[PDB]
Scaffold this active site. Structure first.
Site, PDB file in Angstrom:
ATOM      1  N   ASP A  15       0.384  -1.576  -0.272  1.00  0.00           N
ATOM      2  CA  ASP A  15       0.502  -0.471  -0.067  1.00  0.00           C
ATOM      3  C   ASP A  15       0.562   1.520  -0.148  1.00  0.00           C
ATOM      4  O   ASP A  15       0.292   1.876   0.372  1.00  0.00           O
ATOM      5  CB  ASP A  15      -0.970  -0.373   0.963  1.00  0.00           C
ATOM      6  CG  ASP A  15      -0.234  -0.091   2.530  1.00  0.00           C
ATOM      7  OD1 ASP A  15       1.044   1.090   2.919  1.00  0.00           O
ATOM      8  OD2 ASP A  15      -0.391  -0.652   3.357  1.00  0.00           O
ATOM      9  N   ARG A  29       0.506   6.555  -0.609  1.00  0.00           N
ATOM     10  CA  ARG A  29       0.282   5.576   1.001  1.00  0.00           C
ATOM     11  C   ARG A  29      -1.282   5.649   0.336  1.00  0.00           C
ATOM     12  O   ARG A  29      -2.324   6.999   0.425  1.00  0.00           O
ATOM     13  CB  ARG A  29       0.115   6.360   2.194  1.00  0.00           C
ATOM     14  CG  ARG A  29      -0.784   4.860   3.233  1.00  0.00           C
ATOM     15  CD  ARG A  29      -0.362   4.372   3.199  1.00  0.00           C
ATOM     16  NE  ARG A  29      -0.951   3.178   4.243  1.00  0.00           N
ATOM     17  CZ  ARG A  29      -1.882   2.595   4.263  1.00  0.00           C
ATOM     18  NH1 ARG A  29      -2.400   2.838   3.700  1.00  0.00           N
ATOM     19  NH2 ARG A  29      -2.807   1.735   4.892  1.00  0.00           N
ATOM     20  N   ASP A  34      -5.649  -0.914   3.526  1.00  0.00           N
ATOM     21  CA  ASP A  34      -4.318  -1.592   4.151  1.00  0.00           C
ATOM     22  C   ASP A  34      -3.763  -2.689   4.115  1.00  0.00           C
ATOM     23  O   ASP A  34      -4.502  -4.112   4.033  1.00  0.00           O
ATOM     24  CB  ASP A  34      -4.634  -1.716   6.370  1.00  0.00           C
ATOM     25  CG  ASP A  34      -3.364  -2.178   7.240  1.00  0.00           C
ATOM     26  OD1 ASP A  34      -2.408  -1.553   6.374  1.00  0.00           O
ATOM     27  OD2 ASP A  34      -3.429  -2.777   8.038  1.00  0.00           O
ATOM     28  N   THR A  35      -2.852  -3.007   3.471  1.00  0.00           N
ATOM     29  CA  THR A  35      -2.190  -4.471   3.233  1.00  0.00           C
ATOM     30  C   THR A  35      -1.285  -5.039   4.702  1.00  0.00           C
ATOM     31  O   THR A  35      -1.020  -3.393   5.242  1.00  0.00           O
ATOM     32  CB  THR A  35      -1.295  -3.843   1.946  1.00  0.00           C
ATOM     33  OG1 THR A  35      -0.377  -3.230   2.189  1.00  0.00           O
ATOM     34  CG2 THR A  35      -2.372  -4.053   0.669  1.00  0.00           C
ATOM     35  N   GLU A  37       1.485  -5.666   6.943  1.00  0.00           N
ATOM     36  CA  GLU A  37       3.059  -5.715   7.352  1.00  0.00           C
ATOM     37  C   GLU A  37       4.341  -6.298   6.822  1.00  0.00           C
ATOM     38  O   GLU A  37       3.613  -7.696   6.835  1.00  0.00           O
ATOM     39  CB  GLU A  37       2.805  -5.370   8.609  1.00  0.00           C
ATOM     40  CG  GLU A  37       4.443  -4.297   9.351  1.00  0.00           C
ATOM     41  CD  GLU A  37       4.775  -3.197   8.190  1.00  0.00           C
ATOM     42  OE1 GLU A  37       3.388  -1.900   8.160  1.00  0.00           O
ATOM     43  OE2 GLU A  37       5.401  -3.222   7.334  1.00  0.00           O
ATOM     44  N   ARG A  81       3.349  11.052   3.887  1.00  0.00           N
ATOM     45  CA  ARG A  81       2.924  10.756   2.475  1.00  0.00           C
ATOM     46  C   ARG A  81       1.951  10.946   1.773  1.00  0.00           C
ATOM     47  O   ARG A  81      -0.062  11.535   2.164  1.00  0.00           O
ATOM     48  CB  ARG A  81       2.473   9.517   2.763  1.00  0.00           C
ATOM     49  CG  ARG A  81       3.425   8.322   3.860  1.00  0.00           C
ATOM     50  CD  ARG A  81       3.255   7.353   4.378  1.00  0.00           C
ATOM     51  NE  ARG A  81       2.021   7.116   5.254  1.00  0.00           N
ATOM     52  CZ  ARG A  81       1.178   6.150   5.475  1.00  0.00           C
ATOM     53  NH1 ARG A  81       2.824   4.762   5.614  1.00  0.00           N
ATOM     54  NH2 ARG A  81       0.912   5.831   6.467  1.00  0.00           N
TER      55      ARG A  81
HETATM   56  C1  LIG Z   1      -4.695   5.686   4.919  1.00  0.00           C
HETATM   57  C2  LIG Z   1      -3.809   6.398   5.929  1.00  0.00           C
HETATM   58  C3  LIG Z   1      -2.916   5.674   6.886  1.00  0.00           C
HETATM   59  N1  LIG Z   1      -2.930   6.558   7.833  1.00  0.00           N
HETATM   60  C4  LIG Z   1      -1.741   7.000   9.062  1.00  0.00           C
HETATM   61  C5  LIG Z   1      -2.888   5.842  10.058  1.00  0.00           C
HETATM   62  C6  LIG Z   1      -1.538   5.487  10.388  1.00  0.00           C
HETATM   63  O1  LIG Z   1      -0.828   6.072  11.717  1.00  0.00           O
HETATM   64  P1  LIG Z   1      -0.273   5.105  13.055  1.00  0.00           P
HETATM   65  O2  LIG Z   1       1.258   5.303  12.282  1.00  0.00           O
HETATM   66  O3  LIG Z   1       0.381   6.301  13.481  1.00  0.00           O
HETATM   67  O4  LIG Z   1      -0.701   4.071  13.763  1.00  0.00           O
HETATM   68  C7  LIG Z   1      -0.648   4.875   9.912  1.00  0.00           C
HETATM   69  C8  LIG Z   1      -0.997   3.265   8.922  1.00  0.00           C
HETATM   70  O5  LIG Z   1      -0.622   3.602   7.642  1.00  0.00           O
HETATM   71  P2  LIG Z   1       0.991   2.025   7.544  1.00  0.00           P
HETATM   72  O6  LIG Z   1      -0.492   0.888   6.889  1.00  0.00           O
HETATM   73  O7  LIG Z   1       1.136   2.316   6.330  1.00  0.00           O
HETATM   74  O8  LIG Z   1       1.779   1.778   8.573  1.00  0.00           O
HETATM   75  O9  LIG Z   1      -1.155   6.010   8.903  1.00  0.00           O
HETATM   76  C9  LIG Z   1      -3.311   8.109   7.932  1.00  0.00           C
HETATM   77  O10 LIG Z   1      -3.320   8.917   8.986  1.00  0.00           O
HETATM   78  N2  LIG Z   1      -4.397   8.794   7.188  1.00  0.00           N
HETATM   79  C10 LIG Z   1      -4.798   7.572   5.553  1.00  0.00           C
HETATM   80  O11 LIG Z   1      -5.482   8.002   5.325  1.00  0.00           O
HETATM   81 CA   LIG Z   2      -0.069  -1.217   5.565  1.00  0.00          CA
END
Ligand SMILES: Cc1cn([C@H]2C[C@H](OP(=O)(O)O)[C@@H](COP(=O)(O)O)O2)c(=O)[nH]c1=O
Ligand SMILES: [Ca+2]
Length: 135
Positions: A15, A29, A34-35, A37, A81
């Site tokens: 993702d 992103r 959510d794919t 980890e 991102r």
């Molecule tokens: C998809 C997305 C993720 N995020 C944030 C939530 C998560 O915060 P935290 O990292 O603090 O938990 C993280 C999840 O992404 P990843 O799946 O890339 O880890 O990115 C956003 O803030 N907004 C979005 O629209």
């Molecule tokens: Ca992810």
């Protein structure tokens, strides 16, 4: 919502990828999904993570053209991102992953949820077909 051109720099995982947008390198992103980890140690390599990365990588690398479509809310997250729906030859990567059971609809933050229902119906199909994550 307007689509715009972008150039693939490098797929990072299921993702997240790096694109050249408006002449500037950025990591994007995928919105609403959510794919699993494969990076962060706090989670580890989650089942289907490697598969989701391979799917995304293949999809974006083989495309003639890539477009990014921002939603109506903020365009970047706290990590800086770009937040968008990415299209590879007119096919939405976000939906493609969910349809294959390689991603779950997640992180739904209003007002960035224009395509939420579309992705939800695709996830319901993957689930009923018991695909990958739903197997
Ligand atoms: C998809 C997305 C993720 N995020 C944030 C939530 C998560 O915060 P935290 O990292 O603090 O938990 C993280 C999840 O992404 P990843 O799946 O890339 O880890 O990115 C956003 O803030 N907004 C979005 O629209
Ligand atoms: Ca992810």
């Amino acid at each position: 919502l307007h689509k715009e051109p972008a150039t693939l720099i490098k797929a990072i995982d299921g993702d997240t990828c790096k694109l050249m947008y408006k002449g500037q390198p950025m990591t994007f992103r995928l919105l609403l999904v959510d794919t699993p980890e494969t990076k962060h140690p706090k989670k580890g390599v989650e089942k289907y993570g490697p598969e989701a990365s391979a799917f995304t990588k293949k999809m974006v690398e083989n495309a003639k053209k890539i477009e990014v479509e921002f939603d109506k809310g903020q365009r970047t997250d706290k990590y800086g991102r770009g937040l968008a729906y990415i299209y590879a030859d007119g096919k939405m990567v976000n939906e493609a992953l969910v349809r294959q059971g390689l991603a779950k609809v997640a992180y739904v933050y209003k007002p960035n949820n224009t395509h939420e229902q579309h992705l939800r119906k695709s996830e319901a199909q993957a689930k009923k077909e018991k695909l990958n994550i739903w197997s």
